[PDB]
Amino acid sequence: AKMAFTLADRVTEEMLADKAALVVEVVEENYHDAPIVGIAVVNEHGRFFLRPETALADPQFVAWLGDETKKKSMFDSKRAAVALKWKGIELCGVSFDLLLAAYLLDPAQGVDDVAAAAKMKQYEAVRPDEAVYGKGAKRAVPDEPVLAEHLVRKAAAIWELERPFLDELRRNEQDRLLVELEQPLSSILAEMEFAGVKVDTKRLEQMGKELAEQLGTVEQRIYELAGQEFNINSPKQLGVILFEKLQLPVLKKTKTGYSTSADVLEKLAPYHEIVENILHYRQLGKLQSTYIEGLLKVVRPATKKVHTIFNQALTQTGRLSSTEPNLQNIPIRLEEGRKIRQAFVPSESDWLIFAADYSQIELRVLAHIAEDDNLMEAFRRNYGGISDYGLAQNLNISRKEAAEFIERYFESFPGVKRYMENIVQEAKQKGYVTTLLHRRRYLPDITSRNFNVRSFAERMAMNTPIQGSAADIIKKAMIDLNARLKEERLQAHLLLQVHDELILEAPKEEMERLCRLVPEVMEQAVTLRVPLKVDYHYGSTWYDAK
DNA sequence: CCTGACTCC
DNA sequence: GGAGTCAGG
């Protein structure tokens, strides 16, 4: 463990080379408006650590950061890019992201620091972040020399690992997936996250006031029906009320006790009316805790904006996730919760929200992959590896009739049946399944002798190519869309992606254009054997974009 | 801290 | 099938 570097006091010309590994260290998990604690640069000329107060106020270093012809290899470049946006600095020229490279090679490793990526190539001259910063309340930036060494070691690791990772991606036919899709998408997501979405806090607070009143009412009604006060938000206490006091049938247990899941409670409605009230209560309580209170807590008060983080290197299928706040699970199915969307508004006066969604993209993808004539034919003119049991439990119908449904289904769509058979056999033979744009998921459990383990892996084999291909497509569509927006000099920009949906805001005068541009681009992102279809709506709030 | 509840795709 | 957050414990 011997590695020389310069702890620099000022920026020098040799630090500004046209190819470098760059570390812009942000220690907080949520990098919005978070401190940059240190910088490291490794390039042909040497290894350098820079204090951010120095480097970020240096016009030549800022210039270098923003120069796209000066190429940087990084790890989680979006964290750096956004943290620098909050410092009013533009980051360009990112040509390699070790995080996204590691993610494509194997999503299951859950790589989230340089040390874990390095482990994939047996590179061990770098420590884990957790080792250096510590955890929980003990989390702290160490003394400068210890910090400096770590940052330089991380940059040095990125320097040496770039070619080995690129080499393996290319052997996997995933190099273009990294360079032409994930990496450009990363810059787009950074834009969306920094832009944020404006919230109508006056409206959200008034909703919370009315909701608190309504919860109280429902709560007292439940106690009345139960004959006793108890904590409705405790499945344990609730279980005692339902299955001991009221002596309702026990339909399901889990490892900790009686199940009070929504499915179960719905099936108990013919026994006691309290179960319908309880389901209602738990819905309203989630609205209050999460979409009123939890959302207000993360609103930046001066701008009334919320800034999510789209985790690009987390899910096993290639989807994004959204955290702090999650803006990909805002209520829509019940009118009571859907009204939450009235609180999401345009960031400027006389702008509107525009929302466009793919219709049944996973079913069109299945049609394409399976080349099922009947299914493809229908699309030119169901989501349930569900079993007869799950289907019956889902539809609250006869398990015998459920079995007949699934049977009839594969009779009618023999291409889909063939596909399900073939993809499982392929997974067993190769050890992984792949998506349309060459995303991979490894399934080492697929030949387990244990029924449950094997079966879960077989269902992943069936679903991942479908769900992950749909992810591939919308990602490409975002890249295509952004470009067309910039070409036409539109002010419209993306705010959110919700898996098979894109949400934008824009001057009212641009709706007409977007109504043609967004759907076309999204539909023409890839050519399948069936058409892609997109629906679109716009309005004064997200609610009204329906 | 995990579990089980609600939320979305 | 894929996700995140919350209260309770």
C-beta of residue A90 within 8 angstroms of C-beta of residue A134: no
Within chain A, which residue ranges are assigned CATH 3.30.70.370?
307-360+471-546
The reply to whether the CB atom of residue A259 sits less than 7 A from any atom in nucleic acid chain B is yes
Query: How many angstroms separate the Cα of A159 from the Cα of each of A41, A164, A165, A274?
Result: 10, 10, 11, 63
**Chosen CATH of A361-470 out of 3.30.2350.10, 2.60.260.20, 1.10.150.20, 3.90.870.20:** 1.10.150.20
C-beta of residue A237 within 8 angstroms of C-beta of residue A278: no
Of A182, A126, A105, A202, residue with least CA distance to A434:
A105
Q: What is the CA radius of gyration of chain A?
A: 26
Burial class (CB in 10 A: 0-12, 13-18, 19+), A532: buried
Within chain A, which residue ranges are assigned CATH 1.10.150.20?
361-470
Over A330-393, what HEC string results?
Answer: CCCCCHHHHHHHHHEECCCCCEEEEEEEECCHHHHHHHHHHCCHHHHHHHHCCCCCCCHHHHHH
Q: Which nucleotides of B are covered by protein (CB under 7 A)?
A: 3-9
Query: How many angstroms separate the Cα of A186 from the Cα of each of A81, A189, A395?
Result: 9, 5, 40
From which experimental method does this structure derive?
A: X-ray
C-beta of residue A493 within 8 angstroms of C-beta of residue A474: no
Angle at Cα A334 formed by Cα A473 and Cα A280, nearest 5°? 130
- The gap from C-alpha A259 to its chain's centroid, in whole angstroms, comes to 29
**Chosen CATH of A307-360+471-546 out of 3.30.450.20, 3.40.50.300, 3.20.20.70, 3.30.70.370:** 3.30.70.370
Beta strand A309-311 with A321-323 is antiparallel
Burial class (CB in 10 A: 0-12, 13-18, 19+), A375: buried
Torsion over CA: A394, A395, A397, A398 (sign): negative
Of A259, A260, A227, A233, residue with least CA distance to A246:
A227
In Å, what is the separation between the CA of A30 and the C1' of C7? 23
Distance spanning both ends of chain A, measured CA to CA: 59
Beta strand A19-25 with A71-74 is parallel
Cβ-based contacts (< 7 Å) between A 165-224 and strand B = none
Of A16, A18, A5, residue with least CA distance to A62:
A16
User: Class of A197-306 per CATH?
Assistant: mainly alpha
Torsion over CA: A264, A268, A274, A279 (sign): positive
CB under 8 Å to A46, separation ≥6 — which residues? Answer: A5, A6, A14
Region at A431 (left for phi over 0; alpha for psi -120 to 50; beta for the rest):
left
Region at A463 (left for phi over 0; alpha for psi -120 to 50; beta for the rest):
alpha
Provide CATH code, domain A1-196. Answer: 3.30.420.10
Of A181, A179, A150, A185, residue with least CA distance to A162:
A179
Torsion over CA: A534, A540, A543, A546 (sign): negative
Within chain A, which residue ranges are assigned CATH 1.20.1060.10?
197-306
CB under 8 Å to A492, separation ≥6 — which residues? Answer: A354, A485, A504, A505, A506, A507, A510, A514
What is the length of chain A? Answer: 546
In Å, what is the separation between the CA of A189 and the C1' of C9? 38
Query: How many angstroms separate the Cα of A399 from the Cα of each of A65, A389, A459?
Result: 62, 6, 20
The reply to whether the CB atom of residue A220 sits less than 7 A from any atom in nucleic acid chain C is no
Q: Which nucleotides of C are covered by protein (CB under 7 A)?
A: 1-9
The reply to whether the CB atom of residue A117 sits less than 7 A from any atom in nucleic acid chain C is no
Nucleotide nearest to A259 (CA to C1'): B4
In Å, what is the separation between the CA of A235 and the C1' of C8? 8
C-beta of residue A511 within 8 angstroms of C-beta of residue A519: no
Instruction: For residues A486 and A394, give the distance between their C-alpha atoms in angstroms, rounded to a whole number.
Output: 46
C-beta of residue A201 within 8 angstroms of C-beta of residue A300: no
Region at A33 (left for phi over 0; alpha for psi -120 to 50; beta for the rest):
left
Within chain A, which residue ranges are assigned CATH 3.30.420.10?
1-196
